[PDB]
């Protein structure tokens, strides 16, 4: 179907602790692939997929430069930002920057984006049209007004329209055995009990990739949600997604609520109710 | 393969 | 990261038109420009062209094209003044470290 | 206003001896750039520092090169010892992301160094 490949860049600055902390990591689709760690001992941009691994020196020292002058690009920033802010020089803040280019089922460019952020708030983004620029009042404004001069949409513009998509194509092709597969949900029901008068049933969905999914009940009819307790899609650890949503119900009417399942990798809507 | 060489700083 | 030059000396008259060019092996390079050196001088940039593209400036126009792997510097009504060391630089994605060719000496005779 | 300042402008040394070589980058300017020249491998980036970090570095050789920037105004690039085969020129160069952007790095004038038998 679609596919991205994003970059998302984190820098904590420490006062006490000299240079700031950084975490570079790249994901194609929900696949990470790379990632830096300023704190440890490598230096180096680190593979993180069977697939990347292939990639020739060339790659590893330039991926790896890349991502260096980024920390100090940020850490710059940080001095920057604790400025126009006015911000006591004890205090650790946040930079966090992300990046990337999304497909279509065709592979052709769909969208681009690159948006950034002082302390876990919006600072300023690149819109859609990948010519200008959206700031969040304040500080946003000026650093707005140091990029329209150096043109720094016009370059970007280049990245994720040509060689981000280029580079993804890469990666979708290369590493084809991984990031183009399905793995159906492995779905499955719980009966513990809340009570004597009720009786905990909750709907699991295990194993999956991707992580695009949807578990859903419904009460005979067509309830649809507020009985329905939806975890955040979480990791697994093996490269797979694991999700639930849980219905605590009047004990002996398990029967009536059912579960249903929808996953790109399912033939039909898988649909689950009360069995044993 | 990122955005490079560096960021434009703010 | 290597470039291939003729490096003359190039001996045109004033008034001529005068082809430089290298051409490079590797593809991940994607901006080329041309630096200019004076004999005893840094180099400075007379002309930069993003990518398969012509940029015209007066009497010099540079060239990239990218299936060959050619990139070329002509000079319209040669002066002597344009006596001079030519390098082509170019560089990629991954870092701002210019790739020079050797250089074409030009000499123009007034 | 003026530019890059590269000392000295010549210099002529034996072999052994540890050559130093300086750079006044133009104020405001982050990037910082050592280029060498010889007639033998052309124009070369030996390494350069942005906002005082080095950034790329491979064409620093194996040994006896080192260089730094302990601030933002001022570089040495290091030989101990000089071997003959570093005769060279040996530019400097400064320049931002705006001129970065379209390529544009500002050159010294360069230090010839021959480093003699």
């Known amino acids: 179907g679609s596919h991205s490949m994003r970059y998302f860049f984190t820098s904590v600055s420490r006062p006490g602790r000299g240079e700031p902390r950084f975490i570079a990591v790249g994901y194609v689709d929900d696949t990470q692939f790379v990632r830096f760690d300023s704190d440890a001992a490598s230096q180096r941009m680190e593979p993180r997929a069977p697939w990347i691994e292939q990639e020739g020196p060339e790659y590893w020292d330039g991926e790896t430069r890349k991502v260096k002058a980024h920390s100090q690009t940020h850490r710059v920033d940080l001095g920057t930002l604790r400025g126009y802010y006015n911000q006591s020089e004890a205090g650790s803040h946040t930079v966090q920057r992300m990046y990337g280019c999304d497909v279509g089922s065709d592979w052709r460019f769909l969208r681009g984006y690159h948006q950034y952020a002082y302390d876990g708030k919006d600072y300023i983004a690149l819109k859609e049209d990948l010519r200008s620029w959206t700031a969040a009042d304040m500080a946003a404004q000026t650093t707005k007004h140091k990029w329209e001069a150096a043109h720094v949409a016009e370059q970007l513009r280049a990245y994720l329209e040509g060689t981000c998509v280029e580079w993804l194509r890469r990666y979708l092709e290369n590493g084809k055995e991984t990031l183009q597969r399905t793995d159906a949900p492995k779905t499955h029901m719980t009966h513990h009990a809340v009570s004597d008068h009720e009786a905990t049933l909750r709907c699991w969905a295990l194993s999956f990739y991707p992580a695009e999914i949807t578990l859903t009940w419904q009460r005979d009819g067509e309830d649809q949600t507020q009985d329905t307790e939806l975890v955040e899609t979480r990791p697994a650890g093996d490269g797979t997604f694991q999700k639930w949503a849980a219905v605590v119900v009047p004990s002996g009417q398990e029967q009536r609520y059912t579960c249903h399942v929808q996953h790109e990798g399912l033939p039909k809507p898988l649909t689950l109710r009360w069995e044993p | 393969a990122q955005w490079g060489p560096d960021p434009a700083a703010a | 990261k290597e470039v291939e030059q003729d490096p003359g000396p190039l001996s045109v008259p004033e008034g001529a038109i005068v082809s430089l060019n290298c051409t490079y092996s590797?593809?991940?390079?994607?901006?080329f420009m041309w630096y200019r050196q004076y004999s005893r001088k840094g180099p400075e940039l007379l002309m930069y062209t993003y990518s398969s593209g012509n940029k015209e400036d007066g009497r010099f126009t540079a060239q990239v094209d990218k299936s060959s792997k050619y990139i070329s510097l002509f000079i319209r009504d040669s002066q002597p003044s344009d006596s001079a060391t030519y390098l082509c630089a170019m560089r990629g994605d991954s870092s701002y470290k210019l790739i020079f060719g050797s250089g074409t000496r030009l000499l123009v005779r007034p | 206003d003026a530019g890059v300042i590269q000392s000295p402008r010549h210099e002529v040394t034996e072999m052994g001896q540890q050559v130093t070589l300086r750079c006044k980058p133009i104020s405001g300017h982050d990037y910082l750039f050592w280029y060498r020249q010889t007639m033998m491998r052309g124009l070369e980036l030996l390494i350069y520092f942005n906002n005082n970090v080095p950034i790329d570095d491979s064409g620093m050789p194996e040994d006896r090169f080192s260089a730094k920037m302990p601030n933002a105004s001022f570089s040495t690039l290091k030989i101990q010892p000089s071997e003959p085969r570093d005769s060279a020129v040996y530019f400097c160069?400064?320049?931002?992301?705006?001129?970065?952007?379209?390529?544009?790095?500002?050159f010294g004038a360069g230090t010839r160094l021959s480093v003699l038998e």
């Open positions: 160069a400064s320049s931002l992301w705006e001129k970065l952007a379209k390529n544009i790095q500002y």
């Open positions: 590797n593809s991940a390079f994607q901006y």
